[PDB]
């Protein structure tokens, strides 16, 4: 056929719409994950029940997605209790929730009753939470849940202001989840593991090298 | 079948399940030959290998009351980290974790074959191409040199730390590789 | 076929058959292209080669008389022992030996097939992959890192140490290759 | 396929598109291996050569703005005389003209091909024979004499003299040959 | 209608592709024509035949056309003989292609007779031939047909560099037409006339102004 006679603009605008597509682009995405959280360490000198800040950076393989969006709300957050102790075992493993980083941690028993999303358990039940991890049936599983309805939009973050009046920290933290050994053994042990299956959602992407 | 190539199914103790009482990173393993004596003596005499299979099965020989488990993973880049602990663990390939007493049901693996309620770490071989047979590890070198040689490394690590060191098992691994190119097994370095 | 690939078949001559009046050790060759000049001409224009063939043909050109032989075999891993007698040369790879004034009758292998009477010592080329080509190699590196540009090493020995040192026969190299990624001869390295 | 016959696709950078600000005469290319560096490296290597594509794609870098076209057309006897003017290029064979500014869509004809608005030359390859592939032209010698190595010239005239002798494009030439009988890259001339 | 608001681009390509039709401008263009070759004429001093160059430049109309090519491919080229003369006439004419430049010319009846395409006639005979000129009938004519199987792609020239070697000459002369007397007349005449009967294939038109 003919030639055709290309017609030179001064320009040709180059524009782009929208968060470049990819794997994390979405204005929102949702996530469920099964996480370790951590050992439930057993102090043999003190009471005090051990926190934990219920935040995606403290969930290595979900904070990797999580950093590339600037906003995040949870949905499930549940904290699975798996012993890995004879049932010869005594003592107990105390679980609940703190919604306001100003309230003080539970050192007993009582308190830790009095607490909302609070489970007790011999340190030697729960094993059936395993399959909790992967499919399902919680009926036989020591579960710690979060409150998660009513709790807004958070910013992700990378980090905590912990010397900071506890309602700025409020701001970016959820919960945290307290965790606490009914007794002292005569030395420090790890009865058991703490998994945690987070379900949340994450909105408006960012440059993961941004995120803080 | 043949034209410098013999399959090769074997058997055999690969080590001791260590439990440290103040170390808490697991304890690696490289999957190669020259790690296994039996089988050594058998790939030694060839310049080429390549894993077909590879498993390595946690046997227990310990009371049902002691407390613990196993953590099992691979690592296929000697440039990664050895897992100080267990989320480290569950969050890597070929995790699997079991009470450091249970296992027993696997020595059915060990003769025939029949894993079910077999504590097992599966390394990924397939895609794992011919590697040179060994007698060593240049770990004093860059990682990607040693990848070269290392398709992957056993990652095993006690869940806690027993009031003292102990060993509540022993690994065996179940690998099945094809052999190349043959070498003098004196010359085979 | 196509899209950065096309094969390559050439000959060569590889070097002379040099029998040490006093070293019983082997000869080492190392089997890439740039130790052709022809074939390395060509090669350097291209950013990866994969041998598909390379056989090293033994053509002698001495009396009937000369007593000894030639011992050829191939070495595939550089951290491997070079070959220091017979019994070394003859448990390796390829290994192929015949007296030093045998083997006119393989010249038809130069030009056309029929190795029916040669003295070839064929390297395994079947599953040797994509190799990047080099100008050169690190000698002083960790044998490792030369394997990643070594399919392998030819080792040449003589049986026999003559009274002086002597060239019996040629080496002639009979290569089959494809090259894939195009590059400027000159910064090929 | 085979037998002394080696067939080859490459692309090279031929020259610089040059305007002469005094000069109306075209500029002419020998269309053989020697003029390309890369493609000069392969075919020295051989002793027959046989252009089977030959084509040489115009690639403009300059302002839209620019004034001129530029004009190509391929001599196919040496005796011809190259084109001093639009209307010589216009009447004589693979004749192309397109506004300097004009080409860029053609970069996909580099990679891969789908030469749509592309400002291409081809030369007439079909019909055309088995040449030896030298290392010079003889242009001190009879036209006849140089034919029998020179396929064809591609003339490149600018339609145009600029104020100032300026470069506005490149050409680059996608050829595609096949080679026959080997010789040392060095005694190749 | 509405005036159409024409945009201007900085400039608009001016392309042609191909040669500018016409005439000649196809790739290759194949033409069959009849061209007077020349005379015979008869020495009557020497028997050496007489050569004639079988080459385009040599056919002035055919030249024409061919000069607008820059290769050409002959496929037929016949030399049809035209007797001029009364059945009394004695003599013969001989004729032969030479295909190597290099080769000698033949001075007499046997070696004409051992060269390619040889053919001798009666002076007086082939009159029919002139039918052949334009419709058909070779059967009653006296053609010397050079072979052309087998003759590649020549370059079109203006010109034979003669001073060469023959073997530079044999890159563009396909053939020579050797034209011999059976005898030598008491003084020189032309007993007839030479006719081509030209087939070829013109290929890669070029200005003719450049051709040479
Ligand atoms: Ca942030
Ligand atoms: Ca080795
Ligand atoms: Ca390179
Ligand atoms: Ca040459
Ligand atoms: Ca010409």
Known sequence: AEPQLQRAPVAQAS???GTVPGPLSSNTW???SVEFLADFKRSSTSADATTYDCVPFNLPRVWSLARCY???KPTRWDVVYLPEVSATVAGSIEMCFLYDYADTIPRYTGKMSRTAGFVTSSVWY???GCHLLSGGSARNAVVASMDCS?????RVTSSIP??????VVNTILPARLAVRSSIKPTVSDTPGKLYVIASMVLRDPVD???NT
Chains 1, 5 share one sequence.
């Open 208 to 210: 993961p090298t941004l």
């Open 30 to 32: 949702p996530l469920h």
């Open 162 to 167: 912990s010397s900071v009046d506890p309602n």
């Open 126 to 128: 729960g094993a059936e």
């Open 15 to 17: 524009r782009i719409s």
């Open 70 to 72: 600037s906003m995040w």
């Open 150 to 154: 009513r709790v807004g939009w958070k």
